[PDB]
Design a protein around this nucleic acid. Structure first.
Lengths: 1049, 147, 49, 139
RNA sequence: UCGA
C-alpha cells in the first residue's frame, strides 16, 4: 500500500492518541477540595455521522462525528457518583481515500518534517580562537537546555536569558559534591569549580532566582525551577525523547517519558567534557536519523492538548463560584473552546492544504508530500543553502528529483516508493540480506531505520546477479559512512530491493529515466500531475508497469472484494453476489465536479456473468484506463522544423486531433448566488425582473431559476434576483426624462447572477438549498442556489501541452491533414516537434520512447520497460533497434526500418509532394494536456471597479482588474523618451476621480485635452504624513509671495 | 584530509616520533616533524564495557566460546534479596516486622486510610502513604484517642 | 563523451567518476551523484534572482 | 541484542532469591564469549585500562614456505612488491612472526606527511574505519 | 500553493 502515513496515523489517533490525552487531563480538583472530575477516555462512543460523503460536498458541510465520553462526577465528603455522557466536540473523520472534507471541500494534511527531540552537540568557532563545544537538549514540548563551553575550562548553562555557571543548576536540582565527581574526568571540572564558588543545597536556589527573575525567596527558587523541567503538563520529552536519551548518552533507565531525570543532566555534562578529550561524536542537524516526521495522529494530539487546557480554566471557574450541590456534570464541560480548536486546525491552519485533484497521480502525490514548513518547523526567510540541498542520508527515503521549482526549491519534498515510517517517526527502507556474496531473496526485508551509515555496507539495486549462485560482478560499488566506494562482493551486507527505490511514485512513470537529465526529469514529474482527464484515455505503449499500482491506491477505482459472479451491469451500478443478504451494490459516480474544475466520471468495465478476484478492476476512473493509469494519448510525432511554427518550444499539431475528440476534456464549473436579508427589505428570487425582456427569460420556469439541460452562453441570467433600494436622490436630468415618457422607476434593483465573459456550457445540476427542508443555512440568507455548468472543451491554439520528459510547449497552429507531412504508406503526421530543444537539454529518453512506441505500434504488444538497467549498450540501443527490425520483417511493412539510417525513415512533404533531403525520426509519442488552457489566461479591462482608499483600479481576472505597471516598467519608459506616455499611465488611467472623467469624455467627443490634475495617491500620502506630526506642505516660489498651496481643496 | 583505516588490530610505528607543541590555538595537538610510516596489524577487536575487568593476561591462549571478560558486580550493604516478578535485581539491607500486625481499610467516614487494628485493642491510623519517602525521626502512624 | 567528475553538496569532488553519458545510460549509483549538482544548480538560481 | 563488533554477552546470576547475602560479595556475573580462538595480544601495561581486546585468529596469519633460502630478520617489516630471493615474489605486506615455513602476520602501512597532527597512540587498538591521522597540505 |  502506498498510503500508510495517513491511514496508520489516523488509526493510531483513534485508539492510542485520543486515550492518552484524556488520561493526562483527568483528574481535576477544586480550590477547596469539595468535588473532583475525572473522565473515562477509553470508553468513548464516536457515534454515526449526519450526512453522506457526496452529500457533504454539495450541502457545504463537513463529514464529522459527535464525540461523547462517560463522565463520573464524584464528591469528597458526600458519597455520590454522577455518571453522565457529555458532548465533547466535533471531529471530522478520514474518508476511504485518506482525506478529510472541510466545508464541502476535500482537504489533506501534509506531513511536516521537524527535528527529533534529544541532545545534540556541535563544534562552534565564534571567532579566530579556541575550539568551543556546545549542546542542546531539545524536548518534545517545554524549555530548552543549552550547555556551552568557553575557553580555559568553563562550562556554562543557558536556560534566551544570560548564561550561568554549571554548578548553579547542578546543585539546585538536588545533588552532593561526591555524587557528581564519581560519574564524571574530574580534572577538567576543577577549572569551572574554582571561579564559581562551592554552593550548598540551599546556597544555589537564591542566586538562581536573582538572575532569572531580577527580592529572592527560598520558596520562589524551587517553584521556578520545578515548573520548567519537573512539572507535569508543562514539560514533555515524548516517547521518542526517552529513546534518543538512552541511545546517545547510553543510559540504563527507561520508560520515564514525563519528568526530566536529574541524572540525565549529569550525563549531558559528562559527554560535553569528553568532547575536548577527542572522544565522542558530533551530531548533524540535516541527518535523517535526527529528523522526524509527524502526521495526523500527532498533529491532532497537540490541538486537543491546547484545547483541553482552555477547558481546564472554565472547569475550575465553575466549581468555585457555585458553592451549592446537586449540579449535573454535563454543564461543567463547555465544548465551545474545543470545537473552535479543531476547526482552526482543519480550516485555518497552514499545514491543512487544498487538495489537488486534477488526475489520480496528483492525488497520490499530495498525500505523500514532506514539507519542512509549518507552526514549529522552518521559515521562508530562515531557509538556507544547507537545508535545501540533498543529504547523503536521503538515499531511498526522500525523492531527490521531485521537488517544486521556484521559491519552495527543496523545502517541499516527496516520499520515495518503498519508504515507510515507523511508530517513532523515522523513514525506513527495505533491504535484502547478502550472505557470502549471495543475495538472500527468500525471506522478508530488514527495513533499516537509517542505521546503515556507520555500521553496514549497502549496495544499490543495479549490480548483475546470478540465479541463486553468486554475484556476477567482481567490483561492487557501495556506500559506507556517506561515501561511495567499490569493495569486494563478499564484504557487503545489504542490497536494495528495487531500482526505483530512490525515485518517487511520480518519477517512476517516466520511461528511460537514466537517459534524461535530472533537471528535465524534475519538470517531467511536475507536468504529469497537471494532466487533465480526457474523454477517452489510452494506455501508454512504453509504460513502466507501475501505473497499475498507482490507480488502485488512488481510491477512484472500484475493486472487487468477494470473488463472486457479476449479475447486472449498467451505467450507474454493478451488482455481484458473494460466495465461497448476498447482493451488494457498487455505486458509480457520473460527471462529478472536482476541486480543479475537472470531471470524476467512472465507467463500467466488467460484463454480466464473469468470475472476479479480490483486487480486480470493476470500474475505472476518469484518467484511468483498464487496469493501468492513462493520462494522455499515443499519436505520431516527427522531429522536423516547420515554417517557423515550432521556432522556440512551440508545437504544431494537425486537424485530426480535433475531430477525433483527442485531448478533449470535460470541465464542470460551479456558480453561487444567495438571497440575503437586506435591512431595507427582504430579497427574493423572481422572474419578472426590470429592464430585461424575453431575450433572457427563455430558460426560467416562472421561479427565477434556470432549468436542467439549458444551453447557456456568455451574458445570460442563471438566477434572477432583485434588491430593494431607498435612495430617492434622482438628478434633475433623469427627473425630466422620466416625466416625458412616463414609466416611473420601481424600488427594486436587478442583482441577477450572470455568466462571466468567455464562459459557456450545459447546465447539469440546479440544486437549490433553502430553509425548512432539513439542511442548515448560514445566517443572513433565505435561499441558497447552486448551479453546476458542464462544458466540453476541445484542443485549440494556445493550449499548453507536454510529455513525460519535460518537453512542454504551446500550440500555435492547427494545420489540416493535407498540409502535414505523410509517411510512405500515406499516413499523415500528427505532431511536428522541433529537434533543436533535444540536444541542448539532454532529453535523450524521449527519442528512445518514440522509437520504441513506434515498434509497439506496428506489432501491437504494449511494452513494459522498467528503468535503471542489464548489459551496457545492449539494453537500450539494441532493444529499440532490435525490435524495430522485427517489425520490418513483416511482408506488408518494409519501410519501417532502414539499414543506413536506423532510427529514421523518409518523410514526404504534404504541400508539394516532394521528399525531404534528409530522413526524419518518426515515432509514437505520449503527450499530455495540461491545465494551463488558453481560456483561463484571457483578461481585458476598459473601465471597471476601483480601490477603496487609493481609488486605483483593482487586480484580478474574476473581478475585472487592471494590469500592474510596477517600478521596473517605469524605468523602461524613463530610459525612453516617453514622458507623455508615463504621465498618462499615472494620472488619467489610475487614481484620479476628475482626470478619468475628462479623459473618457474626450475620446467619445473626439477632442483630447492635455494637463491632467494631481493624482489621488499623492494626496493620501500628504494627509498621512501630517498625521505623523510632520508639517509638510507645498509652496510657490513666485515673486514676493510664499504661500502654501491647497492640493486637496 | 581525514585518513581512515581499513583493518583493525595493533598500531605499529616506523620512523615517526611525536611532539608536544602545545600553544593557545586548540591546546590539544601532536605534530610529527618527520612523518614516516604507521602500520596496523591484523586481528579481531572486541570492545569491552567500562565496568568490566579483563581476566585474560598477555600471551594466553583462548578457546572457542570460552570466557574473555567477567564483570564484577558487587553490591555492598545488603543482607536479604527479594524479587517476585521483575527485571532488575534489588537488595534489602534491613527489614522490620512487628508482631500481631493486622491492617484494615475501614474508612467509611472520609478519605480511605488503612487503620491498623493491633491485638492490644488499639486503632492506629496510617499517616504515611504508600509511595513517598521517609526520613529520620518522621511520623509513620498516629493512633485515634477517644479521650 | 564522458560526464566528468561531479562534487558533493558541500563541494568535495568525489573520486568515483561517471564514465557513461546520457546515450549509454547512467546507473543508480551515477544518478544520485548527478542529482547533487542538479539540486545545487536549482537552489542557486532562485537566490540569484 | 549485542553489536557485531562487541561479541557474545551472557547473563548469569550467582545467587538466587531469598538468601543471606553477605555485604561485599558478588551478585551477578556477566561474562563475554569469544567468537574465534587464537592468542590474546595488545595487553595494556597500566592498570584500570580495559576498553577492547585483540583476538588474532588463524586466518590473520599467512604462511609462506619458500624452498630456496629463508632470509628474514626478527622485527623486520616486509612490504609486498619486493623479492627476497630471485625466483619468488610477495603478495601481502606485514610483519614476520617466526624465523622453514615463514609465517607472515598481515598488515597495511600508511604514509604520514611531516607536520601532520595524529589522533592515535603507539600500542593501542583500533576498529574498522576510525580516524587515525589528519594530514595537512597546501592547495 | 501553482505558472514564467
Amino acid at each position: 500500500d502506498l498510503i500508510e502515513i495517513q491511514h496508520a496515523s489516523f488509526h493510531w489517533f483513534l485508539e492510542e492518541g485520543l486515550i492518552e490525552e484524556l488520561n493526562s487531563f483527568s483528574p481535576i480538583s477544586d480550590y477547596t477540595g469539595k468535588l473532583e472530575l475525572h473522565f473515562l477516555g477509553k470508553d468513548y462512543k464516536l457515534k454515526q455521522p449526519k450526512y453522506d460523503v457526496d452529500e457533504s460536498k454539495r450541502r457545504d458541510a463537513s463529514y464529522s462525528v459527535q464525540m461523547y465520553v462517560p463522565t463520573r462526577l464524584i464528591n469528597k465528603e458526600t458519597g455520590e457518583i454522577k455518571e453522565q455522557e457529555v458532548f465533547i466536540g466535533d471531529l471530522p473523520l478520514m474518508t476511504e481515500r485518506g482525506t478529510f472534507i472541510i466545508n464541502g471541500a476535500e482537504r489533506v494534511i501534509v506531513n511536516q518534517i521537524v527535528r527529533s527531540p534529544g541532545v545534540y552537540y556541535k563544534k562552534e568557532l565564534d571567532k579566530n580562537g579556541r575550539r568551543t563545544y556546545s549542546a542542546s537538549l531539545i524536548p518534545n514540548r517545554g524549555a530548552w537546555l543549552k550547555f556551552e563551553t568557553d575557553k580555559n575550562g568553563l562550562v556554562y548553562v543557558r536556560i534566551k536569558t544570560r548564561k550561568l555557571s554549571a554548578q548553579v543548576l547542578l546543585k539546585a536540582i538536588g545533588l552532593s559534591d561526591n555524587e557528581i565527581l564519581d560519574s564524571l574526568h574530574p580534572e577538567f571540572y576543577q577549572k569551572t569549580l574554582d571561579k564559581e564558588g562551592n554552593p550548598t543545597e540551599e546556597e544555589a536556589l537564591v542566586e538562581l532566582y536573582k538572575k532569572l527573575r531580577p527580592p529572592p525567596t527560598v520558596s520562589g527558587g524551587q517553584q521556578l525551577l520545578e515548573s520548567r523541567f519537573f512539572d507535569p503538563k508543562r514539560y514533555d520529552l515524548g516517547r521518542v525523547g526517552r529513546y534518543k536519551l538512552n541511545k546517545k548518552l547510553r543510559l540504563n533507565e527507561a520508560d520515564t517519558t514525563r519528568v526530566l531525570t536529574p541524572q540525565d543532566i549529569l550525563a549531558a555534562i559528562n559527554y560535553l567534557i569528553n568532547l575536548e578529550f577527542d572522544v565522542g561524536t558530533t551530531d548533524d542537524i540535516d541527518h535523517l536519523g535526527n529528523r522526524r516526521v509527524r502526521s495526523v495522529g500527532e498533529l491532532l494530539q497537540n490541538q486537543i492538548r491546547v484545547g483541553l487546557n482552555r477547558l481546564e480554566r472554565i472547569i475550575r471557574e465553575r466549581m468555585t463560584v457555585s458553592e451549592s450541590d446537586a449540579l449535573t456534570p454535563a454543564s461543567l464541560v463547555n465544548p465551545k473552546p474545543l470545537v473552535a480548536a479543531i476547526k482552526e486546525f482543519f480550516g485555518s491552519s497552514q499545514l491543512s492544504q487544498f487538495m489537488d485533484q486534477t488526475n489520480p497521480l496528483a492525488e497520490l502525490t499530495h498525500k505523500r508530500r514532506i514539507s519542512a514548513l509549518g507552526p514549529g518547523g522552518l521559515t521562508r526567510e530562515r531557509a538556507g543553502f544547507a537545508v535545501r540541498d540533498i543529504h547523503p542520508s536521503h538515499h531511498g527515503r526522500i525523492c531527490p528529483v521531485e521537488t517544486p521549482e521556484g521559491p519552495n526549491a527543496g523545502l517541499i519534498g516527496s516520499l520515495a516508493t518503498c519508504a515507510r515510517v515507523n511508530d517513532y517517526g523515522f523513514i525506513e527502507t527495505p533491504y535484502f540480506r547478502v550472505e557470502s556474496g549471495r543475495v538472500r531473496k527468500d525471506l522478508d526485508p530488514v527495513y533499516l531505520t537509517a542505521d546503515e551509515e556507520d555500521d553496514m555496507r549497502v549496495a544499490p539495486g543495479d549490480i548483475p546477479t546470478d540465479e541463486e549462485g553468486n554475484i556476477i560482478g567482481e567490483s561492487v560499488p557501495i556506500r559506507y559512512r556517506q561515501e561511495f566506494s567499490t569493495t569486494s562482493p563478499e564484504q557487503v551486507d545489504y542490497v536494495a530491493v528495487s531500482p526505483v527505490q530512490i525515485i518517487s511514485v511520480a518519477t517512476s512513470m517516466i520511461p528511460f529515466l537514466e537517459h534524461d537529465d535530472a533537471n528535465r526529469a524534475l519538470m517531467g514529474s511536475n507536468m504529469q500531475r497537471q494532466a487533465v482527464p480526457l474523454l477517452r484515455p489510452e494506455r501508454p505503449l512504453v509504460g513502466t508497469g507501475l501505473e497499475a499500482q498507482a490507480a488502485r491506491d488512488s481510491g477512484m477505482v472500484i475493486v472487487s472484494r468477494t470473488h463472486g459472479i457479476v449479475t447486472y451491469v449498467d451505467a450507474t451500478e454493478i451488482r455481484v453476489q458473494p460466495h465461497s443478504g448476498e447482493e451488494i451494490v457498487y455505486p458509480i459516480q457520473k460527471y462529478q465536479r472536482s476541486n480543479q474544475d475537472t470531471c470524476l466520471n467512472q465507467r463500467p468495465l466488467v460484463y454480466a456473468g464473469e468470475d472476479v478476484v479480490p483486487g480486480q478492476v470493476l470500474a475505472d476512473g476518469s484518467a484511468t484506463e483498464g487496469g493501468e493509469l492513462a493520462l494522455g494519448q499515443n499519436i505520431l510525432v516527427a522531429y522536423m522544423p516547420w515554417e517557423g511554427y515550432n521556432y522556440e518550444d512551440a508545437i504544431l499539431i494537425s486537424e485530426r486531433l480535433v475531430y477525433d475528440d483527442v485531448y478533449t476534456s470535460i470541465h464542470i464549473e460551479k456558480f453561487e448566488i444567495e438571497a440575503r436579508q437586506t435591512k431595507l427589505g427582504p430579497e427574493e428570487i423572481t422572474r419578472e425582473i426590470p429592464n430585461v425582456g424575453e431575450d433572457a427569460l427563455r430558460n426560467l420556469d416562472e421561479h427565477g431559476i434556470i432549468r436542467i439541460g439549458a444551453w447557456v452562453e456568455s451574458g445570460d441570467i442563471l438566477v434572477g434576483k432583485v434588491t430593494p433600494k431607498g435612495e430617492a436622490d434622482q438628478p434633475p436630468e433623469e427627473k425630466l426624462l422620466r416625466a416625458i415618457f412616463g414609466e416611473k422607476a420601481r424600488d427594486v434593483r436587478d442583482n441577477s447572477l450572470r455568466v462571466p465573459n468567455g464562459e459557456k456550457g450545459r447546465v447539469v445540476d440546479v440544486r437549490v438549498f433553502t430553509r425548512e427542508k432539513g439542511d442548515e443555512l448560514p445566517p443572513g440568507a433565505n435561499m441558497v442556489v447552486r448551479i453546476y455548468v458542464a462544458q466540453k472543451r476541445k484542443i485549440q491554439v494556445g493550449d499548453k501541452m507536454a510529455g513525460r520528459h519535460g518537453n512542454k510547449g504551446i500550440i500555435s497552429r492547427i494545420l489540416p491533414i493535407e498540409d502535414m507531412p505523410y509517411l510512405p504508406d500515406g499516413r499523415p503526421i500528427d505532431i511536428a516537434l522541433n529537434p533543436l530543444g533535444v540536444p541542448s537539454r539532454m532529453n535523450v529518453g524521449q527519442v528512445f520512447e518514440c522509437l520504441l512506441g513506434w515498434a509497439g505500434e506496428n506489432l501491437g504488444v504494449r511494452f513494459k520497460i522498467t528503468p535503471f538497467d542489464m548489459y551496457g549498450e545492449e539494453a537500450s540501443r539494441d532493444t529499440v533497434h532490435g525490435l524495430l527490425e522485427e517489425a520490418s520483417q513483416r511482408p506488408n511493412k518494409d519501410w519501417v526500418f532502414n539499414e543506413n539510417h536506423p532510427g529514421k525513415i523518409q518523410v514526404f512533404d504534404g504541400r508539394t509532394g516532394e521528399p525531404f533531403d534528409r530522413p526524419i525520426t518518426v515515432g509514437q509519442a505520449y503527450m499530455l494536456k495540461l491545465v494551463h488552457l488558453v481560456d483561463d489566461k484571457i483578461h481585458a479591462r476598459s473601465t471597471g471597479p476601483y480601490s477603496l482608499v487609493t481609488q486605483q483600479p483593482l487586480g484580478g481576472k474574476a473581478q475585472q482588474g487592471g494590469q500592474r505597471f510596477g517600478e521596473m516598467e517605469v524605468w523602461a519608459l524613463e530610459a525612453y523618451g516617453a514622458a507623455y506616455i508615463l504621465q498618462e499611465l499615472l494620472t488619467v488611467k489610475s487614481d484620479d476621480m476628475q482626470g478619468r472623467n475628462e479623459a473618457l469624455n474626450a475620446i467619445v467627443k473626439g477632442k483630447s485635452i492635455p494637463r491632467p490634475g494631481t493624482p489621488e495617491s499623492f494626496k493620501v500620502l500628504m494627509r498621512e504624513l501630517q498625521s505623523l506630526g510632520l508639517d509638510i506642505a507645498a509652496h510657490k516660489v513666485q515673486l514676493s509671495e510664499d504661500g502654501e498651496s491647497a492640493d486637496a481643496e | 584530509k581525514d585518513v581512515a583505516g581499513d583493518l583493525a588490530g595493533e598500531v605499529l610505528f616506523d620512523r615517526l616520533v611525536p611532539e608536544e607543541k602545545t600553544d593557545r590555538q586548540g591546546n590539544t595537538t601532536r605534530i610529527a616533524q618527520r612523518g614516516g610510516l604507521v602500520w596496523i596489524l591484523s586481528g579481531e577487536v572486541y570492545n569491552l564495557p567500562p565496568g568490566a575487568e579483563p581476566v585474560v593476561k598477555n600471551d594466553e591462549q583462548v578457546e572457542v566460546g570460552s570466557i574473555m571478560a567477567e564483570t564484577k558486580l558487587v553490591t555492598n550493604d545488603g543482607g536479604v534479596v527479594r524479587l517476585v516478578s521483575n527485571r532488575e535485581i534489588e537488595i534489602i539491607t534491613a527489614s522490620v516486622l512487628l508482631d500481631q500486625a493486622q491492617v484494615k481499610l475501614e474508612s467509611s467516614g472520609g478519605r480511605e486510610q488503612y487503620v491498623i487494628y493491633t491485638a492490644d485493642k488499639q486503632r492506629f491510623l496510617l499517616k504515611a502513604a504508600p509511595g513517598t519517602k521517609v526520613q529520620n525521626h518522621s511520623i509513620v502512624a498516629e493512633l485515634i484517642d477517644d479521650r | 563523451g564522458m560526464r566528468g567528475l561531479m562534487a558533493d553538496p558541500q563541494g568535495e569532488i568525489i573520486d568515483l567518476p561517471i564514465k557513461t553519458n546520457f546515450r549509454e545510460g547512467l546507473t543508480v549509483t551515477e544518478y544520485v551523484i548527478s542529482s547533487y549538482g542538479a539540486r545545487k544548480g536549482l537552489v542557486d538560481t532562485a537566490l540569484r534572482t | 541484542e549485542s553489536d557485531p563488533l562487541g561479541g557474545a554477552s551472557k547473563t548469569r546470576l550467582l545467587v538466587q532469591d531469598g538468601d543471606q547475602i553477605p555485604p561485599g560479595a558478588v551478585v551477578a556475573r556477566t561474562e563475554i564469549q569469544c567468537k574465534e580462538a587464537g592468542t590474546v595480544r595488545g595487553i595494556k601495561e597500566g592498570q584500570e585500562s580495559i576498553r577492547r581486546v585483540l583476538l588474532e585468529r588463524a586466518a590473520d596469519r599467512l604462511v609462506v614456505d619458500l624452498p630456496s633460502a629463508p632470509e628474514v630478520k626478527p622485527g623486520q617489516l616486509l612490504v609486498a612488491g619486493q623479492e627476497l630471493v630471485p625466483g619468488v615474489k610477495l603478495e601481502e605486506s606485514g610483519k614476520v612472526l617466526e624465523i622453514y615455513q615463514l609465517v607472515l602476520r598481515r598488515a597495511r602501512p600508511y604514509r604520514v606527511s611531516p607536520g601532520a597532527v595524529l589522533h592515535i597512540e603507539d600500542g593501542d587498538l583500533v576498529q574498522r574505519g576510525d580516524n587515525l591521522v589528519l594530514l595537512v597540505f597546501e592547495r
